[PDB]
From a paper:
Mpf2Ba1 is a 53.2 kDa protein isolated from Pseudomonas monteilii through a multi-step purification process informed by artificial diet bioactivity screening against WCR larvae. The protein is comprised of two domains—an N-terminal MACPF domain and a C-terminal β-prism domain. Pore-forming proteins (PFPs) are a major class of soluble proteins that oligomerize into rings and undergo large irreversible conformational changes to become transmembrane assemblies and breach the membrane of target cells. We have identified and characterized the non-Bt insecticidal protein Mpf2Ba1, providing mechanistic details for how it effectively kills the devastating maize pest WCR by forming pores in midgut membranes targeting a different binding site than the insecticidal proteins currently deployed in commercial transgenic maize hybrids.
Author numbering: 2 to 482
Write the structure that this text describes.
């Protein structure tokens, strides 16, 4: 029997009817033509029209041809239309946030080493989850495809442009870096060329990779959980994946999104009785929306519509050197790290350290008598200024060994008054480095000297009950990497 993650559906509608009205498109023009040729900022969202969006092309007056599979509807002759009446998955995952960002950015064919769909991070996932180095990330999208539209990058495209949009591009003052930035901000660095109309259901999840069942990959487990929530798991998938799904829900935070179809049936797609999902699916036909990309040609660079080589190269250069790095930097998010440790001592387990500090919940005199003692950490957020120093190493010293150079030494005795050796935690900090900064510290205890380290952690040598009895006790560290 299976625990499924609970949430509220976020239903999105795009503004397509209003975009069509603005373009003056006839109702015989296939749904989706209004989105082809839209100026696009590829940083903001995954396969969403930004409310900004300006059409470059005059599809109202362009020559049309009938859609063969949909009698009575028309598409510009230049636009290829492919029927695709199917349900497919567009799944992205990463073992780390940066790996998830790469995997998102490269889920479609867009050139440049940037955080391309990372504006989605602020709604797909939550702040604390994004910055927890214990977490991996999945985005499961089931697309309810009806058709796709493709605009091939043909030499005749400038001619199809709205005259005012063509003039605006041609008169861009490309000696002025601020004008080029503004043009990218207000019309786009790209334009849409390969879009899928229909519906989508999305489950975006942050999962504790150090605690979830590892029989299967998080992508597989996340997809099985999605299928659970929508009533689409077979009896065999339930038997095989049920335990994994339960673990997933115990160790994940999930976000539910629906687009396309009837908004009144959207809440309910994740109920999951199959009939509830299916009633939403069956509504997609009557209200398609832009939901996914044609992966091979999602969009073209806007300077391909420049008349001249000189203007195109000034715009490409500005993109790579100024505008895109500025955009991509708004989504550079690194995990919280530890920058300071204190020790707390007291007469019970409910003692609390001072305000910035959280207890590792293991009495460092466990089984040995004496005070309740807790190692406590301060979590620091990463900021591209400076940032600050990360704890990179912990070293336990005993009795009268000298503080190693230059470690800080916490002067409280991790054996007080349980007897035994005098035990002292030391640590060093260095300039923040992703390869080095300790994200998490824990403490383990056991009845034998050589304990199992928590998955992903390293044990710090030095028993924190050394010379007393009780348990063997070690600090352990985790570097997300
Ligand atoms: Mg102790």
């Amino acid at each position: 029997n299976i625990d499924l993650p609970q949430g509220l559906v976020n239903f999105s509608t795009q503004h397509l009817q209003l975009i069509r009205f603005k373009a003056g498109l006839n109702e015989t023009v296939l749904p989706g033509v209004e989105a082809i040729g839209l100026g696009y900022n590829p940083f903001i969202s995954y396969a969403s029209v930004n409310s900004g969006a300006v059409q470059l092309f005059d599809w109202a007056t362009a020559k049309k041809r009938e859609v063969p599979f949909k009698a009575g509807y028309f598409v510009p002759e230049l636009v290829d239309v492919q029927q695709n009446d199917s349900a497919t998955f567009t799944n992205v995952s990463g073992n780390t946030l940066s790996e998830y960002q790469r995997s998102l950015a490269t889920s479609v064919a867009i050139e440049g080493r940037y955080n391309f769909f990372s504006g989605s991070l602020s709604t797909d996932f939550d702040s604390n989850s994004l910055r927890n180095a214990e977490n991996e990330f999945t985005r499961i999208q089931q697309s309810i495809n009806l058709w796709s539209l493709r605009l091939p990058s043909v030499k005749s495209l400038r001619e199809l442009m709205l005259p005012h949009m063509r003039q605006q591009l041609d008169e861009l003052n490309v000696n002025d870096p601020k004008a080029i930035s503004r043009y990218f901000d207000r019309v786009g660095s790209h334009f849409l060329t390969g879009i899928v109309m229909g519906g989508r259901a999305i489950l975006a999840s942050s999962t504790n990779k150090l605690r979830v069942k590892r029989d299967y990959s998080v992508s597989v487990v996340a997809k099985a959980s999605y299928e659970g929530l929508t009533g689409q798991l077979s009896a065999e998938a339930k038997a095989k994946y049920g335990e994994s799904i339960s673990s997933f829900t115990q160790y994940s935070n999930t976000h539910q999104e629906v687009r396309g179809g009837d908004g009144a049936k959207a809440h309910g797609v994740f109920s999951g009785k199959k009939e509830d999902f299916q009633a939403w699916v069956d509504s997609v036909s009557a209200s398609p929306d832009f939901v996914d990309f044609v992966p091979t040609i999602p969009m073209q660079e806007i300077w391909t519509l420049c008349s001249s080589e000189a203007q195109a190269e000034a715009m490409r250069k500005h993109f790579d050197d100024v505008w895109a790095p500025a955009q991509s930097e708004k989504f550079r998010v690194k995990a919280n790290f530890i920058d300071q440790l204190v020790v707390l001592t007291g007469g019970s387990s409910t003692i609390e350290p001072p305000v910035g500090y959280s207890k590792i919940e293991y009495d460092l005199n466990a089984g040995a008598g004496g005070d309740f003692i807790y190692l406590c950490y301060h979590e620091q957020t990463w900021q591209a200024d400076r940032p600050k120093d990360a704890v990179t190493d912990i070293r336990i010293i005993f009795n009268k060994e000298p503080t190693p150079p230059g470690y800080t030494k916490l002067p409280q005795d991790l054996n007080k008054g349980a007897g035994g050796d005098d035990v002292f935690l030391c640590y060093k900090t260095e300039a923040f480095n992703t390869d080095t900064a300790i994200n998490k510290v824990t403490v383990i205890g056991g009845n034998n000297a050589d304990l199992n380290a928590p998955y992903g952690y390293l044990k710090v040598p030095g028993d924190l009950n050394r010379g007393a009895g009780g348990n063997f006790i070690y600090a352990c560290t985790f570097v997300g990497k």
